[PDB]
Paper text:
JAK3, a member of the Janus kinase family, is pivotal in the signaling pathways of common gamma chain (γc) cytokine receptors. We therefore hypothesized that replacing the cyano group by a fluorosulfate (or sulfonyl fluoride) warhead along with a conformational flip of the phenyl moiety could lead to the first tyrosine-targeting covalent inhibitor of JAK3. Only molecule 25a bearing the sulfonylfluoride warhead in meta position showed an IC50 of 26 nM, close to the inhibitory activity of our non-covalent design starting point (IC50 = 5.2 nM). To validate potential covalent interactions, we performed intact protein mass spectrometry (MS) experiments (3-fold excess compound over JAK3, 4 °C due to stability issues of the JAK3 enzyme, 24 h) to verify whether any of our compounds actually form a covalent bond with the target. Unfortunately, no mass shift as a result of covalent bond formation was observed, indicating that none of the molecules bound covalently to JAK3. We hypothesized that while inhibitor 25a shows nanomolar inhibitory activity, it likely orients itself in the same way as our non-covalent design template 6 where the nitrile points away from the target tyrosine, and therefore the warhead is solvent-exposed rather than pointing towards the hinge region where the target tyrosine is located. We validated this hypothesis by solving the X-ray crystal structure of 25a in complex with JAK3. This crystal structure explains why there is no covalent bond formation – 25a indeed orients itself in exactly the same way that starting point 6 does. While we provide new structural insights into JAK3 inhibitor binding, the JAK3 inhibitors we designed did not achieve covalent binding to the hinge tyrosine side chain.
We aimed to develop covalent inhibitors targeting tyrosine residues in the protein kinases JAK3 and MK2 using structure-based design principles to generate small sets of ligands containing tyrosine-reactive sulfonyl fluoride and the less-explored fluorosulfate warheads. By utilizing a structure-based approach with well-characterized kinases, we focus on Janus kinase 3 (JAK3) and mitogen-activated protein kinase-activated protein kinase 2 (MK2, also known as MAPKAPK2) as model targets. In conclusion, we successfully synthesized a small but diverse set of novel fluorosulfate and sulfonyl fluoride warhead-bearing compounds, initially designed to covalently target tyrosine residues in both JAK3 and MK2 using structure-based design principles.
Author numbering: 1 to 8, 13 to 20, 23 to 37, 45 to 163, 169 to 218, 221 to 278
The structure:
Protein backbone atom coordinates (compact mmCIF):
# COMPACT_ATOMS: atom_id res chain seq x y z
CA UNK A 1 0.00 0.00 0.00
CA UNK A 2 2.20 2.77 -1.40
CA UNK A 3 0.60 6.22 -1.10
CA UNK A 4 0.36 8.27 -4.27
CA UNK A 5 -2.01 11.21 -3.76
CA UNK A 6 -5.20 12.66 -2.30
CA UNK A 7 -8.49 11.91 -4.09
CA UNK A 8 -10.93 13.48 -1.59
CA UNK A 9 -12.07 11.71 6.52
CA UNK A 10 -9.81 11.44 3.48
CA UNK A 11 -9.49 9.14 0.44
CA UNK A 12 -6.06 8.48 -1.03
CA UNK A 13 -4.86 6.86 -4.24
CA UNK A 14 -2.49 4.00 -3.42
CA UNK A 15 -0.64 1.31 -5.33
CA UNK A 16 -1.09 -2.04 -3.60
CA UNK A 17 5.75 -8.14 -4.89
CA UNK A 18 7.40 -4.76 -4.24
CA UNK A 19 8.10 -4.16 -7.95
CA UNK A 20 5.77 -1.16 -8.36
CA UNK A 21 3.73 -3.52 -10.60
CA UNK A 22 0.70 -3.67 -8.27
CA UNK A 23 -2.80 -2.37 -9.13
CA UNK A 24 -4.04 1.04 -7.94
CA UNK A 25 -6.70 1.23 -5.22
CA UNK A 26 -8.59 3.98 -3.40
CA UNK A 27 -8.06 3.98 0.37
CA UNK A 28 -10.08 5.76 3.01
CA UNK A 29 -8.64 6.73 6.40
CA UNK A 30 -9.57 9.17 9.19
CA UNK A 31 -7.39 11.84 10.82
CA UNK A 32 -17.19 8.40 14.78
CA UNK A 33 -15.33 5.50 13.16
CA UNK A 34 -16.05 4.10 9.70
CA UNK A 35 -16.48 0.57 11.07
CA UNK A 36 -20.07 1.17 9.97
CA UNK A 37 -19.07 2.34 6.49
CA UNK A 38 -16.90 -0.77 5.95
CA UNK A 39 -19.69 -3.13 7.07
CA UNK A 40 -22.24 -1.40 4.83
CA UNK A 41 -20.11 -1.31 1.68
CA UNK A 42 -18.89 -4.89 2.17
CA UNK A 43 -22.49 -6.16 2.13
CA UNK A 44 -23.50 -4.19 -0.96
CA UNK A 45 -23.18 -5.95 -4.33
CA UNK A 46 -24.48 -3.79 -7.21
CA UNK A 47 -23.02 -2.85 -10.60
CA UNK A 48 -23.94 0.76 -9.64
CA UNK A 49 -22.20 0.91 -6.25
CA UNK A 50 -18.45 1.14 -5.85
CA UNK A 51 -16.86 -2.24 -5.13
CA UNK A 52 -15.43 -3.10 -1.71
CA UNK A 53 -12.12 -4.98 -2.04
CA UNK A 54 -11.15 -5.52 1.60
CA UNK A 55 -9.48 -3.96 4.62
CA UNK A 56 -5.92 -3.20 5.51
CA UNK A 57 -4.36 -1.65 8.60
CA UNK A 58 -2.87 1.75 9.30
CA UNK A 59 0.32 2.61 11.27
CA UNK A 60 0.93 0.27 14.19
CA UNK A 61 -2.14 -1.77 13.14
CA UNK A 62 -4.13 0.65 15.35
CA UNK A 63 -6.23 1.83 12.40
CA UNK A 64 -8.36 0.26 9.65
CA UNK A 65 -8.22 1.31 6.03
CA UNK A 66 -11.00 0.57 3.54
CA UNK A 67 -9.74 -0.86 0.25
CA UNK A 68 -11.89 -0.20 -2.81
CA UNK A 69 -11.68 -0.07 -6.60
CA UNK A 70 -10.15 3.15 -8.01
CA UNK A 71 -11.92 4.82 -10.95
CA UNK A 72 -9.38 7.17 -12.65
CA UNK A 73 -12.07 8.75 -14.83
CA UNK A 74 -13.02 10.42 -11.55
CA UNK A 75 -16.27 11.93 -10.36
CA UNK A 76 -19.31 12.50 -12.54
CA UNK A 77 -19.31 16.20 -11.73
CA UNK A 78 -15.89 16.81 -13.31
CA UNK A 79 -16.60 14.45 -16.20
CA UNK A 80 -19.81 16.34 -17.09
CA UNK A 81 -18.16 19.77 -16.92
CA UNK A 82 -15.20 18.86 -19.12
CA UNK A 83 -17.10 16.93 -21.76
CA UNK A 84 -20.42 18.79 -21.82
CA UNK A 85 -19.91 19.60 -25.50
CA UNK A 86 -20.16 15.89 -26.39
CA UNK A 87 -22.58 14.23 -23.91
CA UNK A 88 -26.17 13.94 -25.13
CA UNK A 89 -29.48 13.83 -23.28
CA UNK A 90 -29.68 10.06 -23.82
CA UNK A 91 -26.38 9.49 -22.01
CA UNK A 92 -27.54 11.68 -19.09
CA UNK A 93 -30.75 9.58 -18.86
CA UNK A 94 -28.56 6.44 -18.84
CA UNK A 95 -26.57 7.86 -15.92
CA UNK A 96 -29.83 8.83 -14.14
CA UNK A 97 -31.27 5.35 -14.46
CA UNK A 98 -28.04 3.76 -13.11
CA UNK A 99 -27.92 6.01 -10.09
CA UNK A 100 -31.66 5.46 -9.43
CA UNK A 101 -31.17 1.71 -9.42
CA UNK A 102 -28.29 1.89 -6.96
CA UNK A 103 -30.51 4.01 -4.71
CA UNK A 104 -33.25 1.40 -4.87
CA UNK A 105 -30.72 -1.23 -3.72
CA UNK A 106 -29.71 1.06 -0.82
CA UNK A 107 -33.35 1.70 0.14
CA UNK A 108 -34.09 -2.04 0.34
CA UNK A 109 -31.26 -2.34 2.92
CA UNK A 110 -32.69 0.54 4.94
CA UNK A 111 -29.65 2.56 4.05
CA UNK A 112 -29.77 6.37 3.99
CA UNK A 113 -26.90 7.57 1.77
CA UNK A 114 -27.39 11.26 2.67
CA UNK A 115 -24.38 12.55 0.66
CA UNK A 116 -25.68 11.74 -2.84
CA UNK A 117 -24.39 14.30 -5.35
CA UNK A 118 -22.57 14.31 -8.71
CA UNK A 119 -19.25 14.79 -6.84
CA UNK A 120 -19.52 11.33 -5.21
CA UNK A 121 -20.80 9.45 -8.21
CA UNK A 122 -17.87 7.90 -10.09
CA UNK A 123 -17.32 7.22 -13.79
CA UNK A 124 -16.14 3.65 -14.32
CA UNK A 125 -16.34 4.39 -18.06
CA UNK A 126 -18.16 6.70 -20.52
CA UNK A 127 -21.41 4.63 -20.17
CA UNK A 128 -21.34 3.38 -16.57
CA UNK A 129 -21.41 5.19 -13.23
CA UNK A 130 -21.33 3.99 -9.64
CA UNK A 131 -22.39 5.59 -6.34
CA UNK A 132 -19.56 6.19 -3.88
CA UNK A 133 -18.83 8.09 -0.62
CA UNK A 134 -20.64 6.08 2.05
CA UNK A 135 -19.16 8.27 4.81
CA UNK A 136 -22.47 9.70 6.08
CA UNK A 137 -24.47 6.63 5.22
CA UNK A 138 -26.49 5.28 8.14
CA UNK A 139 -28.79 2.28 8.47
CA UNK A 140 -32.37 2.90 9.63
CA UNK A 141 -33.59 1.02 12.75
CA UNK A 142 -35.84 -1.92 11.76
CA UNK A 143 -38.82 -0.08 13.31
CA UNK A 144 -38.33 3.52 12.08
CA UNK A 145 -37.85 5.20 8.67
CA UNK A 146 -35.70 8.17 9.65
CA UNK A 147 -33.06 9.31 12.07
CA UNK A 148 -32.01 12.59 13.65
CA UNK A 149 -28.51 14.01 14.18
CA UNK A 150 -27.13 16.66 16.52
CA UNK A 151 -24.03 21.23 1.76
CA UNK A 152 -27.26 23.12 2.12
CA UNK A 153 -28.49 23.14 -1.50
CA UNK A 154 -28.64 19.32 -1.65
CA UNK A 155 -30.54 18.81 1.62
CA UNK A 156 -34.27 18.45 2.05
CA UNK A 157 -35.87 21.26 4.11
CA UNK A 158 -36.62 18.97 7.07
CA UNK A 159 -32.92 18.05 7.19
CA UNK A 160 -31.94 21.73 7.23
CA UNK A 161 -34.63 22.65 9.73
CA UNK A 162 -35.08 19.74 12.15
CA UNK A 163 -31.97 17.60 11.37
CA UNK A 164 -34.14 14.72 10.05
CA UNK A 165 -32.73 12.35 7.41
CA UNK A 166 -34.59 9.49 5.68
CA UNK A 167 -34.79 7.67 2.38
CA UNK A 168 -37.05 10.55 1.30
CA UNK A 169 -34.43 13.15 2.17
CA UNK A 170 -32.28 11.06 -0.24
CA UNK A 171 -35.05 11.47 -2.88
CA UNK A 172 -34.87 15.29 -2.58
CA UNK A 173 -31.12 14.86 -3.10
CA UNK A 174 -31.55 12.65 -6.19
CA UNK A 175 -33.69 15.42 -7.66
CA UNK A 176 -30.77 17.76 -7.15
CA UNK A 177 -28.54 15.13 -8.84
CA UNK A 178 -30.84 15.13 -11.89
CA UNK A 179 -30.46 18.87 -11.96
CA UNK A 180 -26.66 18.53 -11.88
CA UNK A 181 -26.75 16.05 -14.74
CA UNK A 182 -28.97 18.18 -17.00
CA UNK A 183 -26.99 21.35 -16.31
CA UNK A 184 -23.71 19.44 -16.91
CA UNK A 185 -22.75 20.83 -13.47
CA UNK A 186 -22.30 24.29 -15.01
CA UNK A 187 -21.08 26.83 -12.47
CA UNK A 188 -23.30 29.53 -13.96
CA UNK A 189 -26.50 27.70 -12.98
CA UNK A 190 -25.29 25.67 -9.99
CA UNK A 191 -27.71 25.27 -7.04
CA UNK A 192 -25.62 27.88 -5.20
CA UNK A 193 -25.49 30.30 -8.15
CA UNK A 194 -29.25 29.98 -8.69
CA UNK A 195 -29.64 30.70 -4.99
CA UNK A 196 -27.68 33.95 -5.18
CA UNK A 197 -29.82 35.19 -8.09
CA UNK A 198 -33.02 34.20 -6.26
CA UNK A 199 -32.42 37.07 -3.82
CA UNK A 200 -30.61 39.59 -6.07
CA UNK A 201 -29.08 37.72 5.15
CA UNK A 202 -27.72 34.28 6.17
CA UNK A 203 -27.96 31.77 3.34
CA UNK A 204 -29.62 28.96 5.29
CA UNK A 205 -32.31 31.30 6.63
CA UNK A 206 -33.11 32.74 3.21
CA UNK A 207 -32.96 29.31 1.55
CA UNK A 208 -35.53 27.90 3.97
CA UNK A 209 -37.83 30.87 3.27
CA UNK A 210 -37.50 30.37 -0.51
CA UNK A 211 -38.17 26.64 -0.23
CA UNK A 212 -41.19 27.23 2.03
CA UNK A 213 -42.75 29.62 -0.54
CA UNK A 214 -42.38 26.83 -3.15
CA UNK A 215 -39.46 28.32 -5.11
CA UNK A 216 -37.38 25.53 -6.66
CA UNK A 217 -34.48 25.32 -9.11
CA UNK A 218 -35.56 26.22 -12.69
CA UNK A 219 -35.61 23.69 -15.54
CA UNK A 220 -32.18 23.57 -17.24
CA UNK A 221 -32.75 25.28 -20.63
CA UNK A 222 -31.81 22.08 -22.48
CA UNK A 223 -33.66 19.68 -20.12
CA UNK A 224 -36.44 17.31 -21.36
CA UNK A 225 -39.78 18.38 -19.89
CA UNK A 226 -40.48 14.97 -18.37
CA UNK A 227 -37.18 15.08 -16.46
CA UNK A 228 -38.03 18.48 -15.03
CA UNK A 229 -41.36 17.16 -13.74
CA UNK A 230 -39.52 14.32 -11.96
CA UNK A 231 -37.26 16.89 -10.29
CA UNK A 232 -40.18 18.92 -8.96
CA UNK A 233 -41.82 15.76 -7.58
CA UNK A 234 -38.57 14.91 -5.79
CA UNK A 235 -38.74 18.36 -4.18
CA UNK A 236 -42.24 17.98 -2.78
CA UNK A 237 -42.48 19.97 0.50
CA UNK A 238 -43.62 16.99 2.54
CA UNK A 239 -41.33 13.90 2.59
CA UNK A 240 -44.33 11.59 2.15
CA UNK A 241 -45.36 13.21 -1.14
CA UNK A 242 -41.96 12.70 -2.82
CA UNK A 243 -41.98 9.51 -4.98
CA UNK A 244 -39.88 6.55 -3.87
CA UNK A 245 -36.74 5.54 -5.77
CA UNK A 246 -38.86 2.59 -6.88
CA UNK A 247 -41.47 4.91 -8.43
CA UNK A 248 -38.83 7.13 -10.10
CA UNK A 249 -36.89 4.17 -11.54
CA UNK A 250 -39.53 3.10 -14.13
CA UNK A 251 -40.03 6.70 -15.29
CA UNK A 252 -36.33 7.30 -16.00
CA UNK A 253 -36.10 3.85 -17.64
CA UNK A 254 -39.18 4.67 -19.73
CA UNK A 255 -37.52 8.02 -20.60
CA UNK A 256 -34.13 6.52 -21.40
CA UNK A 257 -35.74 3.78 -23.56
CA UNK A 258 -37.21 6.46 -25.86
O1 LIG B 1 -7.44 13.77 -8.10
S1 LIG B 1 -8.83 13.97 -8.36
O2 LIG B 1 -9.06 14.79 -9.50
F1 LIG B 1 -9.50 14.59 -7.12
C1 LIG B 1 -9.50 12.38 -8.71
C2 LIG B 1 -9.19 11.72 -9.89
C3 LIG B 1 -9.72 10.47 -10.14
C4 LIG B 1 -10.56 9.87 -9.21
C5 LIG B 1 -10.91 10.53 -8.03
C6 LIG B 1 -11.73 9.89 -6.98
C7 LIG B 1 -12.37 10.51 -5.94
N1 LIG B 1 -12.93 9.56 -5.11
C8 LIG B 1 -13.76 9.79 -3.92
C9 LIG B 1 -15.25 9.61 -4.22
C10 LIG B 1 -16.15 10.65 -3.55
C11 LIG B 1 -15.67 11.14 -2.18
C12 LIG B 1 -14.19 11.06 -1.90
C13 LIG B 1 -13.41 11.04 -3.21
C14 LIG B 1 -12.66 8.31 -5.62
C15 LIG B 1 -11.91 8.47 -6.78
C16 LIG B 1 -11.50 7.34 -7.50
N2 LIG B 1 -11.81 6.11 -7.14
C17 LIG B 1 -12.52 5.96 -6.00
N3 LIG B 1 -12.92 4.77 -5.45
C18 LIG B 1 -13.64 5.04 -4.30
C19 LIG B 1 -13.70 6.38 -4.12
C20 LIG B 1 -12.98 6.97 -5.20
C21 LIG B 1 -10.34 11.78 -7.78
N1 LIG C 1 -34.35 21.78 -4.40
C1 LIG C 1 -34.26 23.06 -4.74
O1 LIG C 1 -34.92 23.54 -5.68
N2 LIG C 1 -33.41 23.80 -3.99
C2 LIG C 1 -32.92 25.10 -4.20
C3 LIG C 1 -33.77 26.16 -4.47
C4 LIG C 1 -33.24 27.42 -4.67
C5 LIG C 1 -31.89 27.63 -4.60
C6 LIG C 1 -31.05 26.58 -4.33
C7 LIG C 1 -31.56 25.31 -4.12
Amino acid sequence: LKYISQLGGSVELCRYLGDNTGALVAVKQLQRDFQREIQILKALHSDFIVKYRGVSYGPGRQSLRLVMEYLPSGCLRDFLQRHRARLDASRLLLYSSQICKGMEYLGSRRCVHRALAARNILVESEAHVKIADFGLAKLLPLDKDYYVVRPIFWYAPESLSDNIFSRQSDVWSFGVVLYELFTYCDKSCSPSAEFLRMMGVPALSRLLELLEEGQRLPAPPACPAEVHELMKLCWAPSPQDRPSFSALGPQLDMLWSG
